[PDB]
Design an enzyme around this catalytic site. Structure first.
Site, PDB file in Angstrom:
ATOM      1  N   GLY A   1     -40.662 -17.616 -20.068  1.00  0.00           N
ATOM      2  CA  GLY A   1     -41.950 -18.181 -20.455  1.00  0.00           C
ATOM      3  C   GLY A   1     -42.569 -19.185 -19.507  1.00  0.00           C
ATOM      4  O   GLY A   1     -41.973 -19.700 -18.570  1.00  0.00           O
TER       5      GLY A   1
ATOM      6  N   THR B   1     -42.411 -21.938 -10.561  1.00  0.00           N
ATOM      7  CA  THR B   1     -41.520 -20.783 -10.547  1.00  0.00           C
ATOM      8  C   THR B   1     -40.112 -21.259 -10.180  1.00  0.00           C
ATOM      9  O   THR B   1     -39.944 -22.292  -9.537  1.00  0.00           O
ATOM     10  CB  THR B   1     -41.955 -19.664  -9.600  1.00  0.00           C
ATOM     11  OG1 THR B   1     -41.144 -18.519  -9.902  1.00  0.00           O
ATOM     12  CG2 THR B   1     -41.766 -20.007  -8.131  1.00  0.00           C
ATOM     13  N   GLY B   2     -39.104 -20.511 -10.596  1.00  0.00           N
ATOM     14  CA  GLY B   2     -37.721 -20.858 -10.288  1.00  0.00           C
ATOM     15  C   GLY B   2     -37.112 -21.793 -11.325  1.00  0.00           C
ATOM     16  O   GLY B   2     -36.507 -21.352 -12.307  1.00  0.00           O
TER      17      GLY B   2
ATOM     18  N   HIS C   1     -47.159 -18.310 -22.787  1.00  0.00           N
ATOM     19  CA  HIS C   1     -46.760 -16.925 -22.531  1.00  0.00           C
ATOM     20  C   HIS C   1     -45.247 -16.846 -22.689  1.00  0.00           C
ATOM     21  O   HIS C   1     -44.519 -17.726 -22.243  1.00  0.00           O
ATOM     22  CB  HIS C   1     -47.183 -16.478 -21.126  1.00  0.00           C
ATOM     23  CG  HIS C   1     -46.576 -15.186 -20.674  1.00  0.00           C
ATOM     24  ND1 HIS C   1     -46.756 -13.990 -21.312  1.00  0.00           N
ATOM     25  CD2 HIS C   1     -45.752 -14.945 -19.621  1.00  0.00           C
ATOM     26  CE1 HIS C   1     -46.096 -13.044 -20.655  1.00  0.00           C
ATOM     27  NE2 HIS C   1     -45.477 -13.604 -19.630  1.00  0.00           N
TER      28      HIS C   1
ATOM     29  N   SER D   1     -45.036 -17.422 -11.219  1.00  0.00           N
ATOM     30  CA  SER D   1     -45.468 -16.154 -10.657  1.00  0.00           C
ATOM     31  C   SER D   1     -46.540 -15.501 -11.514  1.00  0.00           C
ATOM     32  O   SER D   1     -47.290 -14.658 -11.021  1.00  0.00           O
ATOM     33  CB  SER D   1     -44.257 -15.213 -10.521  1.00  0.00           C
ATOM     34  OG  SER D   1     -43.675 -15.008 -11.811  1.00  0.00           O
ATOM     35  N   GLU D   2     -46.657 -15.903 -12.780  1.00  0.00           N
ATOM     36  CA  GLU D   2     -47.638 -15.348 -13.692  1.00  0.00           C
ATOM     37  C   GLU D   2     -48.790 -16.304 -13.928  1.00  0.00           C
ATOM     38  O   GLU D   2     -49.446 -16.222 -14.968  1.00  0.00           O
ATOM     39  CB  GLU D   2     -46.944 -15.001 -15.028  1.00  0.00           C
ATOM     40  CG  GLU D   2     -45.603 -14.290 -14.885  1.00  0.00           C
ATOM     41  CD  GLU D   2     -45.304 -13.379 -16.070  1.00  0.00           C
ATOM     42  OE1 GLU D   2     -46.022 -12.367 -16.230  1.00  0.00           O
ATOM     43  OE2 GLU D   2     -44.361 -13.664 -16.835  1.00  0.00           O
TER      44      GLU D   2
HETATM   45 ZN   LIG Z   1     -44.347 -12.437 -18.382  1.00  0.00          ZN
END
Ligand SMILES: [Zn+2]
Ligand SMILES: [Zn+2]
Ligand SMILES: [Zn+2]
Ligand SMILES: [Zn+2]
Lengths: 206, 206, 206, 206
Positions: free
Chosen positions: A28, A43-44, A92, A72-73
């Site tokens: 998420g 990220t990560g 998300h 990344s999203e």
């Molecule tokens: Zn996703």
């Protein structure tokens, strides 16, 4: 409404999301509307190692702060903010029941009166597109036009609302609705639904 | 048996209900019989922010204390108290297995001997009516005439008992019975049941 | 090996059983072989209010200590001890997956190599009889003749072993085997099983 | 990178694996590549009683330290290290959803884009062989040739990666993919999948 306070809320929401069982591993992300763009998780970095300083600012042009790597999203978080001016927070995740319904490529129909929480008589399922692409962003923006939550085919869920507390609350409710739908679909198809007239009454009442 | 002690018990029951996994978000409510009406949780306020002073008194006429907003579903708590004089506590929630059975609009039949805990050989499912209405209240009052728990079609569960501890205990047991029923129904329909003679023996023994 | 130490272990096992999700409300009981009979948990008292002094001694004649009320299901704990001289601890619960298989009245067949933990190629399901009766006791004694665990039709599970730690361990493993069986049975019936030759190899190896 | 630090990480991974619900009782094991062989958890000892000194060193010849008994399933950990030079940590468990798919003897197909995490468009299922044998070791070595995780028919899962954190992360993700597959398979067979072209794009992007 300092940046650091918003950063703290994001991190707390991450932890609460994991607590509720909606977030597994690093799947998420949580973002908030801020100045001309947004603050989002990086990220990560696993959620339990997150500190205020890890949160990333991405402006309205899509340029992110120096030396930080946003999720990344991130692109569909920006798509949500531009599609729904009223949205100030976005959650998300790849919650299992929501994701299982997204694999079947089904909308969740009005099996329960709390479906009205997302704005109508259903939870839509936007078509698949590779993660992180502009194509995926376009599908999400169309799906959120008249709903505050949408499933993403073969992927997961996106929920938006006026603040982080409500966005997480919505994301949890949609996972419950998803579990109710799959549990009942295994027994009978189609599943009994409330009429559009009835959902119109609930919508007015909310 | 001061008001504050009863208020504390309500809050503890809320927390325990969430602990047991029966209460998601702000879906449930707990009430107790008090003086000429009842004490119930308020609308809005998330359970972890609840303090003694947030609990709302609603008299026998349905008038609530000044400056407090009772749960949006208070009316069927009052219906339960007027239908079952022996009930002193009421638990309502939207527990997933109970709610999934309510979507199918099925009663839970005697698949396990603990079904007798609610007073007979079944857990009924009252017909749908918009939340918070007098129509819904009437269905609940008829369903609780000879049972201490009932499902509510497309909605959830209501359980009542002589004290908060027992009401929560009953609400948990009904969610287990609901999960047993759905798990077995996915494999075979109908599900094997105990005879009415057998349930009569269990009832006497309890 | 004082009484108080055994009492403490019983209480800790109760708490651990609830922790593992095998025990809901007041459904389970734990007993240990002691002197000429056994120590068992009492009826009523919720597990978190249990103290050393609440544990009940029942002699070999079935007479229980003065002023204490043993579990309502004590008789089949005594049946287990008399049927299996090697058993020193007994765990009973109404764990959901085990109970769901008991409702179908099916044995659990050799779907996984850990089935050999209970002594053979299956987990039996003893026929229904009213709780607390001598008839139920006889069915349990016959089922435990060559197995260390058995399901009880429309009821739950009983597991026995050489100490409390192992008995709980067995009870947990049987609930996992039960969940594997129901999850796979919903997809395909019958479920693929290992041959009796293969289970004979595993049994020797254990 | 002392032995004691690696031992600590193994124990922490054990605890985290149990926390995530992937490890029940004494079913799992965790190992790390070390010197000319590996460090692995011992047989018997329940995870919460594990101390640094209990961890067992097994050299490249399969000889284990004096006075310690390695896990009964150590041989396929060695097979993983010899088959995948890049693997530095191995996680094995009998997680329920993974194991249920292994009972059906099915590979998990590309129902979700995160399937690419294990290296391709599927999670394989290696054929059954008695636990602890060289035959089982050979099946695992063939299955891990082009995948970082594999199911083991009638048994469980093995996941390997460059460090313990990532190996556990992978093992969790595969259990989620397994739960998505079984939940959707109960409704429809076959389950919708992403094309090989699409998975090729995701693989490149990762
Ligand atoms: Zn996703
Ligand atoms: Zn309600
Ligand atoms: Zn029982
Ligand atoms: Zn294994």
């Amino acid at each position: 409404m300092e940046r650091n306070k918003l950063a703290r809320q994001i991190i707390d929401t991450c932890l609460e999301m994991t607590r509720l069982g909606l977030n597994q591993g690093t799947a998420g992300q949580v973002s908030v509307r801020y100045q001309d763009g947004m603050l989002i998780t990086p990220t990560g970095i696993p959620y339990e190692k997150l500190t205020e300083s890890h949160i990333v600012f991405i402006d309205g042009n899509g340029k992110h702060e120096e030396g930080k790597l946003p999720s990344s999203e991130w692109r569909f978080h920006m798509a949500a903010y531009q599609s729904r001016p009223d949205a100030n927070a976005v959650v998300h995740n790849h919650a299992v029941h929501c994701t299982a319904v997204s694999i079947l490529n089904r909308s969740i129909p009005a099996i329960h009166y709390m479906i009205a929480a997302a704005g109508g008589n259903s939870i839509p399922c936007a078509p698949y597109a590779t993660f992180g692409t502009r194509e995926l962003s376009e599908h999400v923006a169309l799906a959120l036009k008249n709903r505050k939550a949408t499933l993403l085919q073969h992927h997961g869920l996106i929920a938006c609302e006026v603040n982080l507390e409500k966005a997480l609350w919505l994301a949890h409710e949609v996972e419950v609705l998803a579990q109710l739908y799959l549990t009942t679909l295994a027994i009978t198809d189609p599943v009994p639904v409330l009429s559009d007239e009835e959902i119109a009454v609930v919508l007015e009442k909310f």
